[PDB]
Amino acid sequence: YKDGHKGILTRELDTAVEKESNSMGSYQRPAQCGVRTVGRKKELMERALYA
Amino acid sequence: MRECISIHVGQAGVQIGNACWELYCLEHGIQPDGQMPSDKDDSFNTFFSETGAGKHVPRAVFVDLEPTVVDEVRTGTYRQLFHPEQLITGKEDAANNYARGHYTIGKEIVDLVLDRIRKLADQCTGLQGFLIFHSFGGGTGSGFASLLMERLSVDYGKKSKLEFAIYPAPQISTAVVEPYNTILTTHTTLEHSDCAFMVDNEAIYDICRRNLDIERPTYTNLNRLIAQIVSSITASLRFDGALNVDLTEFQTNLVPYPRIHFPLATYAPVISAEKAYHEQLSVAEITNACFEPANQMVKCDPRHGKYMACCMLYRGDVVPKDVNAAIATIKTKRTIQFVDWCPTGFKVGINYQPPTVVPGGDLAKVQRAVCMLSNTTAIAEAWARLDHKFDLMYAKRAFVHWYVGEGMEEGEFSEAREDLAALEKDYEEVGV
Amino acid sequence: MRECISIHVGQAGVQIGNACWELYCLEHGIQPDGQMPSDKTIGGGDDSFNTFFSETGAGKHVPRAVFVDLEPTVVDEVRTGTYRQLFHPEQLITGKEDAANNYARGHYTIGKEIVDLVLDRIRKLADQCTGLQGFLIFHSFGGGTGSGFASLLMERLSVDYGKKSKLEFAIYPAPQISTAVVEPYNTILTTHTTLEHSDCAFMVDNEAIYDICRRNLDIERPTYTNLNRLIAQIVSSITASLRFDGALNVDLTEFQTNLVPYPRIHFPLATYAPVISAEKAYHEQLSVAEITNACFEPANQMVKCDPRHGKYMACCMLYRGDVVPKDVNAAIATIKTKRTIQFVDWCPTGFKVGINYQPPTVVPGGDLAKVQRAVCMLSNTTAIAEAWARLDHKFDLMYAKRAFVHWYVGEGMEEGEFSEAREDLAALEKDYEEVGV
Amino acid sequence: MRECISIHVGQAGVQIGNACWELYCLEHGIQPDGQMPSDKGDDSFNTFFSETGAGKHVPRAVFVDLEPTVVDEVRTGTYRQLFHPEQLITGKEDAANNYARGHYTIGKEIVDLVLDRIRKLADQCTGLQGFLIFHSFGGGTGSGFASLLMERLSVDYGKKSKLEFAIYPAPQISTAVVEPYNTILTTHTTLEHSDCAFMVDNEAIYDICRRNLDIERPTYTNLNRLIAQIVSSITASLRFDGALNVDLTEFQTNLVPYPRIHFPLATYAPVISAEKAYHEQLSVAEITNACFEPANQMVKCDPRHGKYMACCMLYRGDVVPKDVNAAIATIKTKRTIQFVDWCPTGFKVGINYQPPTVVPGGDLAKVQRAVCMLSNTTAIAEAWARLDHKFDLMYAKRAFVHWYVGEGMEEGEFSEAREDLAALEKDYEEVGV
Amino acid sequence: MREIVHMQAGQCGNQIGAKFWEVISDEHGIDPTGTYHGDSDLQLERINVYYNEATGGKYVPRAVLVDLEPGTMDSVRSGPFGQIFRPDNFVFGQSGAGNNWAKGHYTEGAELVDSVLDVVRKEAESCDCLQGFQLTHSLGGGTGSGMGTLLISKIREEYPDRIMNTFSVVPSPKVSDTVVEPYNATLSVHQLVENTDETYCIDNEALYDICFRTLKLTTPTYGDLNHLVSATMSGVTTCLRFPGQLNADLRKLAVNMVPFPRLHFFMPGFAPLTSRGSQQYRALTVPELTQQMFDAKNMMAACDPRHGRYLTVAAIFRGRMSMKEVDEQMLNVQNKNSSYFVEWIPNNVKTAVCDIPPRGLKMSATFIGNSTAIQELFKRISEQFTAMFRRKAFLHWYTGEGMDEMEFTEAESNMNDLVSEYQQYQDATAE
Amino acid sequence: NLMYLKNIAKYPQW
Numbered sequence A: 001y002k003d004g005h006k007g008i009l010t011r012e013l014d015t016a017v018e019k020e021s022n023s024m025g026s027y028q029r030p031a032q033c034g035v036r037t038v039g040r041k042k043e044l045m046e047r048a049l050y051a
Numbered sequence B: 001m002r003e004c005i006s007i008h009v010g011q012a013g014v015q016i017g018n019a020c021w022e023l024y025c026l027e028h029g030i031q032p033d034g035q036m037p038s039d040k041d042d043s044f045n046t047f048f049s050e051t052g053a054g055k056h057v058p059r060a061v062f063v064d065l066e067p068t069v070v071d072e073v074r075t076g077t078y079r080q081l082f083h084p085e086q087l088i089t090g091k092e093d094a095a096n097n098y099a100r101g102h103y104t105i106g107k108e109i110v111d112l113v114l115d116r117i118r119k120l121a122d123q124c125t126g127l128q129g130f131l132i133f134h135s136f137g138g139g140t141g142s143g144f145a146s147l148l149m150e151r152l153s154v155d156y157g158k159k160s161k162l163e164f165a166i167y168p169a170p171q172i173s174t175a176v177v178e179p180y181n182t183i184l185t186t187h188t189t190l191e192h193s194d195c196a197f198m199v200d201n202e203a204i205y206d207i208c209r210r211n212l213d214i215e216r217p218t219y220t221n222l223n224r225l226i227a228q229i230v231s232s233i234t235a236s237l238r239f240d241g242a243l244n245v246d247l248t249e250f251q252t253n254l255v256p257y258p259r260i261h262f263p264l265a266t267y268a269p270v271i272s273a274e275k276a277y278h279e280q281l282s283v284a285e286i287t288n289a290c291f292e293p294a295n296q297m298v299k300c301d302p303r304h305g306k307y308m309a310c311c312m313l314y315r316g317d318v319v320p321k322d323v324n325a326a327i328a329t330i331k332t333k334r335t336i337q338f339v340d341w342c343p344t345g346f347k348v349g350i351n352y353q354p355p356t357v358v359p360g361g362d363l364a365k366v367q368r369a370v371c372m373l374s375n376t377t378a379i380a381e382a383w384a385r386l387d388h389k390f391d392l393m394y395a396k397r398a399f400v401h402w403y404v405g406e407g408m409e410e411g412e413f414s415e416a417r418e419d420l421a422a423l424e425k426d427y428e429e430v431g432v
Numbered sequence C: 001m002r003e004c005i006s007i008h009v010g011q012a013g014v015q016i017g018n019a020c021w022e023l024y025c026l027e028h029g030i031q032p033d034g035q036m037p038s039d040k041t042i043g044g045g046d047d048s049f050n051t052f053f054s055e056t057g058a059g060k061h062v063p064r065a066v067f068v069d070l071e072p073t074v075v076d077e078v079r080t081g082t083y084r085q086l087f088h089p090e091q092l093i094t095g096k097e098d099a100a101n102n103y104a105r106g107h108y109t110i111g112k113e114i115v116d117l118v119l120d121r122i123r124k125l126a127d128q129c130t131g132l133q134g135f136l137i138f139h140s141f142g143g144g145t146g147s148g149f150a151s152l153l154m155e156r157l158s159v160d161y162g163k164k165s166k167l168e169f170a171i172y173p174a175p176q177i178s179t180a181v182v183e184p185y186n187t188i189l190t191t192h193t194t195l196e197h198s199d200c201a202f203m204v205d206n207e208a209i210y211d212i213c214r215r216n217l218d219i220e221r222p223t224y225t226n227l228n229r230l231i232a233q234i235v236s237s238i239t240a241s242l243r244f245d246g247a248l249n250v251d252l253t254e255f256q257t258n259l260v261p262y263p264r265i266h267f268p269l270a271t272y273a274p275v276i277s278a279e280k281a282y283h284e285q286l287s288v289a290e291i292t293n294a295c296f297e298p299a300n301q302m303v304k305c306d307p308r309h310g311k312y313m314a315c316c317m318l319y320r321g322d323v324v325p326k327d328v329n330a331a332i333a334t335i336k337t338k339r340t341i342q343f344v345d346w347c348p349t350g351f352k353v354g355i356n357y358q359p360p361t362v363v364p365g366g367d368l369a370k371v372q373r374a375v376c377m378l379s380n381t382t383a384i385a386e387a388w389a390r391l392d393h394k395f396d397l398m399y400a401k402r403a404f405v406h407w408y409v410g411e412g413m414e415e416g417e418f419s420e421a422r423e424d425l426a427a428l429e430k431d432y433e434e435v436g437v
Numbered sequence D: 001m002r003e004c005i006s007i008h009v010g011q012a013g014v015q016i017g018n019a020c021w022e023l024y025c026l027e028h029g030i031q032p033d034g035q036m037p038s039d040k041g042d043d044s045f046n047t048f049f050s051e052t053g054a055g056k057h058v059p060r061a062v063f064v065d066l067e068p069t070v071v072d073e074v075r076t077g078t079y080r081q082l083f084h085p086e087q088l089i090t091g092k093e094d095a096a097n098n099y100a101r102g103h104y105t106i107g108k109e110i111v112d113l114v115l116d117r118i119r120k121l122a123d124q125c126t127g128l129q130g131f132l133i134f135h136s137f138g139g140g141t142g143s144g145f146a147s148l149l150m151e152r153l154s155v156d157y158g159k160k161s162k163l164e165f166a167i168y169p170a171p172q173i174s175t176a177v178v179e180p181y182n183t184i185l186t187t188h189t190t191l192e193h194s195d196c197a198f199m200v201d202n203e204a205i206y207d208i209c210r211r212n213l214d215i216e217r218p219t220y221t222n223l224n225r226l227i228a229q230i231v232s233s234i235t236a237s238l239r240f241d242g243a244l245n246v247d248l249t250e251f252q253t254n255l256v257p258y259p260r261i262h263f264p265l266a267t268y269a270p271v272i273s274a275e276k277a278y279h280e281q282l283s284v285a286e287i288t289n290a291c292f293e294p295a296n297q298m299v300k301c302d303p304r305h306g307k308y309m310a311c312c313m314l315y316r317g318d319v320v321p322k323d324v325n326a327a328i329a330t331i332k333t334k335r336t337i338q339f340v341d342w343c344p345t346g347f348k349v350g351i352n353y354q355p356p357t358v359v360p361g362g363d364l365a366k367v368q369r370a371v372c373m374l375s376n377t378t379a380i381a382e383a384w385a386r387l388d389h390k391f392d393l394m395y396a397k398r399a400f401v402h403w404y405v406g407e408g409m410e411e412g413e414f415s416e417a418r419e420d421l422a423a424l425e426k427d428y429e430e431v432g433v
Numbered sequence E: 001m002r003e004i005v006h007m008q009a010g011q012c013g014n015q016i017g018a019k020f021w022e023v024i025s026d027e028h029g030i031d032p033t034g035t036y037h038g039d040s041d042l043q044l045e046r047i048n049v050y051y052n053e054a055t056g057g058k059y060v061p062r063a064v065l066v067d068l069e070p071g072t073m074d075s076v077r078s079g080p081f082g083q084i085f086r087p088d089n090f091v092f093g094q095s096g097a098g099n100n101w102a103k104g105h106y107t108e109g110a111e112l113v114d115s116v117l118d119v120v121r122k123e124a125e126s127c128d129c130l131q132g133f134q135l136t137h138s139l140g141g142g143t144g145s146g147m148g149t150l151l152i153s154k155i156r157e158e159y160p161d162r163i164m165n166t167f168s169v170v171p172s173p174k175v176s177d178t179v180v181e182p183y184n185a186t187l188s189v190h191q192l193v194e195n196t197d198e199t200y201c202i203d204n205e206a207l208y209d210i211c212f213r214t215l216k217l218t219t220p221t222y223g224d225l226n227h228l229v230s231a232t233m234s235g236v237t238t239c240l241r242f243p244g245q246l247n248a249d250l251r252k253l254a255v256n257m258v259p260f261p262r263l264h265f266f267m268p269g270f271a272p273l274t275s276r277g278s279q280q281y282r283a284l285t286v287p288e289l290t291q292q293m294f295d296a297k298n299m300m301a302a303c304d305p306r307h308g309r310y311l312t313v314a315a316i317f318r319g320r321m322s323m324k325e326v327d328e329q330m331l332n333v334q335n336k337n338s339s340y341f342v343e344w345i346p347n348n349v350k351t352a353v354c355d356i357p358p359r360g361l362k363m364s365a366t367f368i369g370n371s372t373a374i375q376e377l378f379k380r381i382s383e384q385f386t387a388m389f390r391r392k393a394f395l396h397w398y399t400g401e402g403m404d405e406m407e408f409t410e411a412e413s414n415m416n417d418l419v420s421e422y423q424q425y426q427d428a429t430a431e
Numbered sequence F: 001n002l003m004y005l006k007n008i009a010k011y012p013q014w
């Protein structure tokens, strides 16, 4: 045991290391919902008459 | 045409810039790689410049003396959005030192910073103002932003130089030389700034703990709410509305005397999405929400001072009828004290654009919003607090050899104390 | 019919020729074997290549290059490279031994027997041409073949061809970066003996192209291939008006008469804009105002001397691409408003503007971005007197102790040639001072 | 007309005069032989030179001391034929840092001859403006003999303005131990006979050459060059034409309130490196601000602890009176430049057309504008206070007094000098309150 | 791109640095053979602060192993992470210091110091922006106490701008340790006062108390002691090594913790710290971390901090935490222990947050404390110094290898001035 | 050595 005792600071000398910082964990790609609040036929008729 | 250029200086400034450019991209529908998503306008011209192929680079300069935070911006999701040269980084920081950020390290960075500002301002037709986001805490903030504003006042003329500051708390402090840095920056930016929106981290903590119902908040939430503040400031330069208040005359309608450019701030549709729609947020309700001592951005009671002038920026479906019906009910209160020489002390600007919710934030997608900015005399208590702390340390030569050995005459501290004492006397003779 | 002859001499000249003939082949669609590709049918015949290549009747486009050097390594590398079929076998003139960084050895010795071969080759390439406009002579002031043989060849060309425009593209020695210790002796001697024979001498500093490629290209370790490709872009922007249509075309003769005021001040400074990489060209607009303002920036020059220590005498802008003379004139007005850019008093309209319609062509495998507009700045400043003064100072220090003079004396140069060259450049510095004041 | 006699006493005065006369020749271009360069209506040298015969302009200066070799570099150097040999007055034994030795002894054998040479110069002087006496307060022949010459000239010549250039003992960077004795002994006997004393120490010039010049090894040579630039900016209006010309007869009445407060502070701007001048063309408002910064002072005494009495502005070159007006207006509206209450208007500007002349081989660069601010501020009471405190704790246990006693000065003059300078401190306090 | 160069000197310094380069290689994914067996890009983002790039994917620590004996150098070479060091910065003598300050400073310790400065000069000029120097040594030894301080003096002369921190092991209050212990400690601290920017005093009996009581280890073990010291250094330099919400490098810590120049004797701490069998039983919240940090029995320099006031406190938190809890915890401890802080400096707490904990732990927090309680250490050392100075014991060796009474008294008066100014700043009031 | 210690000390005591 001359090198030291395994563990001592943390028991889990495993699980690799975490890769996420605060800014990359919070400031992510902003996802927007596509829940279709307008209507398919109204949308199609709008683009057709606009064109 | 009404372009506005932002300088995010210091680590606090860089993080607030990372929040507010996310908010600006969300507001103008800009993807993180700089592109509009297909087509389905000019409101992006105040913050972005169209390249020609469809890419919109921002009008921002992110400068910091230490690495890893500009590097984390370069590594994060807003990597292709920013131009590589406008993310200026140094090798060695100032390390919480006005002398290091103003006299030794900042001298070899200010030339490149001013060159980038020159390029961005030359690529602008009708520049309105400089939004300088920094922290009074120390280092790349307190000192380098002071040097930058000195050089900008030498170079440019009557251009607006609005600053956002992270002015320290009465109790919360993450530094020891913080009163030194604040008192040395409020000496040198007092003749070089135009409007100083100071916010206080303790007050934002209380706001997001009591109103947004987050018991475990962070700097991301703080910077997003400050981003909402600055977006409400600059919404009139980009979105049309009933009454538009731009930066060139917000100062005229706010500050009476030149060295009183220290307003507070207040955003108050600040409620979480869980409560949100049970409530019936109206113009009068958000007006008395703004006129509340517990809702202010700075830990200072406005009931202890008088209101010299106020400016409310309304956003959404707000109409002038209940705007000036609400401000009259505000004026008919005993608690809201006004100074005798300003009978008409309100300036409001109504904008048609609703606020943009952050998909991953904590604000609710409200229909209407308001940003109060009040030039009150209650900030004299904060000035007295820092002056007391400065005298308490400076009476026995605490932490002065660092500044002296990195190069600074000892009389600069005395001159700064004189300037802040004169500021206290200015506020006292205004209040009387 | 618009015709120009390129004479590459020295190792620097041969390598710059390597980097520019690939660019000419890319611009005119010549694939490296010397032939036009198949399925190339088009109206008009696409006859824009006659300024550099000459069609042989069978589809093979032999160039008009006079690749010459005294030592066989670099020229044999060209002969065994990809352009082996492209270059004519009796065009890569090679010797047995080099001049070995010696102006005397290049000007009075083993350099002086391939002179008749190279003059016969220039004669054949000249009467092959019918409307010859200029000789673009590419070399270095470092010494050896690039100085002595280039100088002697220009001396022979002056009495062989008359008033033909002998444009020079020279690698001037850097203020601090150096390769030879006899660079001052070689450069003083070749400038003295080519002051009366050159017409415009575009000098470029390796150190200047080094820190341009370090800053703007954002690549940490460029080399001579990258420098010579950038010089190739300079020469292409110079000679694009002889082969492509433009709203305002500026050929070499109009260029020279609008550039040089007196027939001794003929050392202009070159600059290219933009020299930006792709990752920043995707971000920047790169408009006409930006590319003109990048030309007058003192650290953006190609000779290590800032123009703030001097006075602009005559400027030549050569734009390429989707540029308009209105935006050009707005840029010129902004430049004339700029305080740090000061012009000489005897030249009010000190600008010569020329637009070419063809956008610049990017080399595959290169580092320059695909930009839709560009500008070549060719200025005449009296700030080159500092470079002349540094070179004169080095020459005075080396000639005070008479170091290295025995090599030149033994190879054949008279001792008084150093004194004559010293007095000639002293007169040139006096001329620059009296013009500037 | 408008002649002026320069008297350089002591080693410091001699070296300052060497730099000064080099600058004077390069201004009024005269070869070291004393001739003229074959003529490239100009009698502009007549303030400092005298045309004698066929082009033999000799300086109107007296290089006087008691110690050899140091006038011998002048006698054997490049300016060996310029000076008349009787003006270069030397001695045989040094005064050796002793005011009593330089006053009541060996300086007595030279005062008559130097006064004879002063009289011979003043006889050629047709309208003498005054004397410029260059010395150091360190001690010896620059102390005692200078004080004795001041006394004898005040006896002989009447009013006859006697501007006194003095090297004040620098606070920390210092080289002599008897300076707190010698300087107070000089001030006690010079306070009633001088009219205006420019004191400039050495440590402040060292800081100026460290910061502004961007060089790390200046010696005494360019210190004397800066002092030469100061005296040229003083006496340039008597030889060159300008919009406003000020002589040596109005400078005293514009910076001397009472006939004891005559110790102004000389500053220069823009002092600049020769290797760094092209970056920016230095403006008039900026160089006035640079004069009024508490770092370009040529004496280590920050003026932020003393209210200004009056100032002389000395613009020289390409200066415009509107730039003067704007600069002085900004200085007056500044708060750290607080003036005294009883002197509401407190300036006198002088604009000269001739630009300052750069010396080849020097450290300064060619500038189209310059200004030499001289203020008679109350801040110098701290330098007097530290000098008196040094003198008090040095004279407490009678240190080094026996040398002066053996030389001839008795015990009472030390106490008289101390009480006279204490009265001067009380006068500054009464003025400042 | 700041760089810290490590300078293990002495047997204690070599043994401590052999564990330090174990912990900051397993925090960066560097195997003993020298490659990168990591997963995140954050480990390779800032690996140049401690590792020079080698050929291939190899990384070489920027450390100069110095000793006057070959024994512990061979032990370091043979142990784990011993093949990672370059075989050129293995500078070693053939005589030994004999636990003598005079033999380390004015004898063959001053002969090898030329080669030591040559190696340090090479490894410091092979950088781009040096942050500074990190010296590990013991005050009561030989070349660590002697030649180590000589190396400090030479480097401070050569580069008087960069940071130079010294993780000095201080001799124990009890037992005896070396017999020339307080002479060596005196003559080392006299040169530590005017040559270093910050000194971390580490006490072996404090480490023994922590290991026996908190970690509940029957065998205390020098490897475990060096592991604790190494974790403390990693928590010190984690702001340079990894990003975070609120970075604070060594110079920022020195600015916020050193009021007066001769007051840079710190008391380090690191308090995620439990027994190995009760790690899963205990939560790792921010207030509980603060409670374990602000404890006198968790301190690593003995010198009970309740016996005096804190000048300054620095706290570096590695984890994904809330700034609100961190700020309220420091406000709470400051308001609670108001009498244990100097009143003339308000808010005596510097906060740093690095959002990368060490491997295994989910939130660590390290502690640095500048306080008046460190004056008891120098009081004791001066007590034994004058006790064996009034009897002229063991001074014959120092006079034999060169140095003598007058600089002995210089060192003793230097500690007396240090103790008196610490007492003055303890007992100084506001008004 | 005690008198020398009290003589060279910046802050002498006892």
Ligand SMILES: Nc1nc2c(ncn2[C@@H]2O[C@H](COP(=O)(O)OP(=O)(O)OP(=O)(O)O)[C@@H](O)[C@H]2O)c(=O)[nH]1
Residues within 6 Å of the ligand: B009, B010, B011, B012, B013, B015, B016, B065, B066, B093, B094, B095, B096, B097, B135, B137, B138, B139, B140, B141, B142, B166, B173, B174, B175, B201, B219, B220, B222, B223, E245, E246
């Ligand atoms: N609101 C908010 N404040 C921040 C944030 N990050 C840092 N701060 C403030 O910044 C202060 C610390 O000083 P910094 O701004 O980091 O110093 P700096 O500008 O980076 O300059 P250096 O000290 O040299 O690194 C703290 O008091 C915080 O209040 C943030 O993300 N949001």
Ligand SMILES: Nc1nc2c(ncn2[C@@H]2O[C@H](COP(=O)(O)OP(=O)(O)OP(=O)(O)O)[C@@H](O)[C@H]2O)c(=O)[nH]1
Residues within 6 Å of the ligand: C009, C010, C011, C012, C013, C015, C016, C070, C071, C098, C099, C100, C101, C102, C140, C141, C142, C143, C144, C145, C146, C147, C171, C178, C179, C180, C206, C224, C225, C227, C228
């Ligand atoms: N810009 C640039 N300069 C080059 C290049 N190749 C050589 N040089 C220059 O050439 C100089 C060296 O002398 P050379 O021109 O090779 O001599 P030479 O013309 O081959 O004649 P000899 O000395 O007889 O071989 C160096 O100082 C370089 O500046 C190149 O590819 N690009």
Ligand SMILES: Nc1nc2c(ncn2[C@@H]2O[C@H](COP(=O)(O)OP(=O)(O)OP(=O)(O)O)[C@@H](O)[C@H]2O)c(=O)[nH]1
Residues within 6 Å of the ligand: D009, D010, D011, D012, D013, D015, D016, D067, D094, D095, D096, D097, D098, D135, D136, D137, D138, D139, D140, D141, D142, D143, D167, D169, D174, D175, D176, D202, D220, D221, D223, D224, D227
């Ligand atoms: N500015 C400047 N000051 C000098 C120079 N030489 C000497 N001094 C100052 O003179 C002081 C010493 O007194 P000196 O003037 O040399 O003495 P002295 O007048 O020759 O009389 P003695 O001491 O008897 O030799 C020093 O403290 C210096 O500050 C110089 O060349 N330039």
Ligand SMILES: Nc1nc2c(ncn2[C@@H]2O[C@H](COP(=O)(O)OP(=O)(O)O)[C@@H](O)[C@H]2O)c(=O)[nH]1
Residues within 6 Å of the ligand: E009, E010, E011, E012, E013, E015, E016, E097, E099, E138, E140, E141, E142, E143, E144, E145, E169, E171, E177, E178, E204, E207, E222, E223, E225, E226
């Ligand atoms: N914490 C710790 N202390 C040690 C270690 N090895 C030795 N020491 C201490 O160092 C002191 C002796 O120092 P020494 O090794 O002889 O110094 P050197 O002569 O320069 O090598 C002893 O009092 C030990 O308490 C170690 O591995 N860890």
Ligand SMILES: [Mg+2]
Residues within 6 Å of the ligand: B010, B011, B012, B066, B139, B140, E247
């Ligand atoms: Mg920071």
Ligand SMILES: [Mg+2]
Residues within 6 Å of the ligand: C011, C071, C098, C144
């Ligand atoms: Mg060759």
Ligand SMILES: [Mg+2]
Residues within 6 Å of the ligand: D010, D011, D067, D094, D140, D141
């Ligand atoms: Mg003398």
